[PDB]
């Protein structure tokens, strides 16, 4: 049985795969071809079919797990393509989490004798986050922040120590947003959530610009000016409003300049992409800040795949949390941000 | 000098006008034609030019104000048309609030000898809200709620007593959203705000559907199904997720089903209008709930013109605040919700 951990989300399936590297002579002989073909197929390819991808840069090398040494691999593909994944399987114990572990339970059971063990999303994310930080990212920090996020000539990624990680506010940006308060290794709760998440960015961006992928949406946003679509404080007051500490550059109304027909006719797709990204990211930051104040937690870590190859949103979150909290809150990021549920699922394997 | 109160917002100008009804014989003789022509023009018309409207149903009759009896009138027009308003004036003491009192200060001063007194938006809104509730709406309650908002066969508008209105959370939904905590008649603060407000609804709706007015956007939304665009909890799990108390009907990702090209090709403009309305309204409710919990305030009153002729959003707010707060928070509404800043400005007249 290959060791796999699976997180079946609304948008992406994330898979963690432990590749043993201490295979003895006797162990190699006493393994079936189907297993050897799986291990070679996964380790000799970085693209699987048309839509599967191995994130090679995230691999943890020479990890000791369950008394064996091996490499931990991180693989993703669209949930829309799970039927292809299951069909390839039909031609073992699977620990699975995410909503799809429930939605697709019956489909996994079409693989003969497969034991499906559905694991709680919250337990998986927390256990996987604590585990990866504890083993380190091949000796480097798993957690980082943007130092001096207020000044762009100084703003720089820097490591952050989570050896005592409690308490922690975890903001999981997937299709929607879930916000978790973690008080200890066995004391954590879902605080609330918001439906304005990564699927809102991608869905609205696709409607507004015709982009066909997440990466294209980000590329458009990198070229745009959100202020062509948004109504700013200075658009309403003529400048700053210091009475309530609002700088003139703050957004007063997202897409608010689009009530004017002449402005809708002049706005570019790139402007609209950037306004969508800014709108969603600022709302996530603000909800995170309000939850952190209510939970009395000053460390806010962001996870999920909305922030994958998305430095714009990461820097916007770092700047916004620091600015609007007057320096009381710190935005934290993790290298394996999309995969903690899949790792936590894999870590449940000894229980079965 | 006619008695006027003006709130110049990012989208609409709101005007409160006190029409004296106790004019004596000597007072009528000793009034200039320009004044008599203004009073007759305002009281004999309900539409002013192409874009001005008198909200006749809101008129307060036989009010005693500043030692005189009169009628209080409520008038609105688009801020885009303020140049026409000022040009009509060029062919007195004006108490004005809103961002436009600052932005357009120099324009008002093109009216010879006009004294412009800019008044704080927060002071104006609070004073005007407390004043209107205190004088009543022609003997009826100014404040109401939706009783039994969970069951549609029973959900009904009912009066709410604000004789002791403190503490109160005021959610001002204009172009953006401002959230105020009111602890006493002289102790109140702006808690925070969100840029996802009425201008976001109108601007995004116009981009997505081509609607040309707020009223058309609402009419489209009344015919639509937001679930064609939104990804629900049941879309991700296959049903409810009781582990975190999430019903299957809850929105997990606003516009989240629009990441699929075939769904973007089948969605109607009415569906998109309704999803925009639901997205913006739920986000406002959630931010209001989080602020109410942090401020330890259980009465949340919604004002602004986003809710004008918008019963869908009002009922959604009433249902959502009650449901997600497990009955700890009550959504409150006010008949004069768009005009409290203009009234509060008028009430500043004795200070000048
Ligand atoms: N290759 C990609 N395809 C689609 N979306 C992507 C991709 N890369 C990054 N994203 C973004 O990542 C978000 C999904 O993040 P992810 O954490 O994998 O969520 P999910 O688990 O699949 N959904 P959920 O059920 O809400 O937990 C999408 O909404 C996009 O904004
Ligand atoms: N006739 C209308 N024209 C435009 N918008 C309308 C109209 N009626 C209702 N609305 C809605 O009301 C919102 C404006 O509300 P309002 O409270 O008057 O804000 P504002 O004061 O002009 N803006 P702000 O500067 O943010 O305080 C718009 O964003 C629309 O969603
Ligand atoms: C995998 C998964 O489950 N994803 C998920 C599921 C749900 C959500 C949204 C959420 O958590 N919601 C909905 C909005 N809410 C409101 C709304 C109006 C008010 Cl007045 N108050 N709260 C709070 C509760 C986010 C992501
Ligand atoms: C007439 C008027 O002034 N309208 C107005 C002005 C401003 C706003 C928005 C607002 O108040 N903002 C901006 C978002 N904010 C964030 C953002 C990211 C984080 Cl991390 N935290 N907070 C909080 C402060 C709303 C309406
Ligand atoms: Mg997920
Ligand atoms: Mg206003």
Swiss-Prot record, chains A, B:
Group of enzyme by EC: transferase
Activity regulation behaviour: Subject to allosteric regulation, exists in two distinct conformational states, a catalytically incompetent (or open) conformation stabilized by the binding of acetyl(acyl)-CoA, and a catalytically competent (or closed) conformation stabilized by ATP-binding. Inhibited by acetyl-CoA and its thioesters which act as allosteric inhibitors and compete with the ATP-binding site. Inhibited by sulfonylureas and thiazolidinediones. Activated by oleoylethanolamide, palmitoyl-carnitine and oleoyl-carnitine.
An example molecular function term from Gene Ontology annotations: vitamin binding
UniProt catalytic activity: (R)-pantothenate + ATP = (R)-4'-phosphopantothenate + ADP + H(+)
Tissue: Highly expressed in the liver.
Consequence of changing residue 190 to A: Loss of catalytic activity
Active-site residues (renumbered): 121
Keywords, ordered alphabetically: ATP-binding, Coenzyme A biosynthesis, Cytoplasm, Kinase, Nucleotide-binding, Transferase
Compartmental location: Cytoplasm
Known outcome of mutating residue 9 to V: Loss of catalytic activity
Major subcellular site: cytoplasm
InterPro entries registered for this protein in UniProt: ATPase_NBD (IPR043129), Type_II_PanK (IPR004567)
Residues involved in acetyl-CoA binding: 175, 178, 190
GO BP, one annotated term: coenzyme A biosynthetic process
Gene Ontology CC annotation, any one: nucleus
E.C. no: 2.7.1.33
Pathway: Cofactor biosynthesis; coenzyme A biosynthesis; CoA from (R)-pantothenate: step 1/5
Result, substituting residue 178 to V: Retains 30% of wild-type activity. Refractory to inhibition by acetyl-CoA. Exhibits a 10-fold increase in the Km for pantothenate
Function description: Catalyzes the phosphorylation of pantothenate to generate 4'-phosphopantothenate in the first and rate-determining step of coenzyme A (CoA) synthesis.
PANTHER family: PANTOTHENATE KINASE, PANTOTHENATE KINASE 3
The family this protein is said to belong to: Belongs to the type II pantothenate kinase family.
Subunit structure: Homodimer.
Name the record gives this protein: Pantothenate kinase 3
């Amino acid at each position: 049985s290959p060791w796999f951990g699976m997180d079946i989300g609304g948008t992406l399936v994330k898979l963690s795969y432990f590749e043993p590297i201490d295979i003895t002579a006797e162990e190699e002989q006493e393994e079936v071809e189907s297993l050897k073909s799986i291990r070679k197929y996964l380790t000799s390819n970085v693209a699987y079919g048309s839509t599967g991808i191995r994130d090679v840069h995230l691999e943890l090398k020479d990890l000791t797990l369950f008394g064996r040494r091996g490499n931990l691999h991180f693989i993703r593909f669209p949930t829309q393509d799970l039927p292809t994944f299951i069909q390839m399987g039909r031609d073992t114990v699977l620990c699975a989490t995410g909503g799809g572990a429930y939605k697709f339970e019956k489909d996994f059971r079409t693989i003969g004798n497969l034991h499906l063990h559905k694991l709680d999303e919250l337990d998986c994310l927390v256990k996987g986050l604590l585990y990866i930080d504890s083993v380190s990212f091949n000796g480097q920090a798993e957690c980082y922040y943007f130092a001096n996020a207020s000044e762009p000539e100084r703003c720089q990624k820097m490591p952050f120590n989570l050896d005592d990680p409690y308490p922690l506010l975890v903001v999981n940006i997937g299709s929607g947003v879930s916000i978790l308060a973690v008080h200890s290794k066995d004391n954590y709760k879902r605080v609330t959530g918001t439906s304005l998440g990564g699927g809102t960015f991608l869905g609205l961006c696709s409607l507004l610009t015709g982009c066909e992928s997440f990466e294209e949406a980000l590329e458009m946003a990198s070229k745009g000016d959100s202020t062509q679509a948004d109504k700013l404080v200075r658009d309403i007051y003529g400048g700053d409003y210091e009475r309530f500490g609002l700088p003139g550059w703050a957004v007063a109304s997202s897409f608010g300049n689009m009530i004017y027909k002449e402005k809708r006719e002049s706005v570019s797709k790139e402007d609209l992409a950037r306004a969508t990204l800014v709108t969603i990211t600022n709302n996530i930051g603000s909800v995170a800040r309000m939850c952190a104040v209510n939970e009395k937690i000053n460390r806010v870590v962001f996870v999920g795949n909305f922030l994958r190859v998305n430095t714009l949103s990461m820097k916007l979150l770092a700047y916004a949390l620091d600015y609007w909290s007057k320096g009381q809150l710190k935005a934290l990021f993790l290298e394996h941000e999309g995969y903690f549920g899949a790792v936590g699922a894999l870590l449940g394997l000894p229980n079965f």
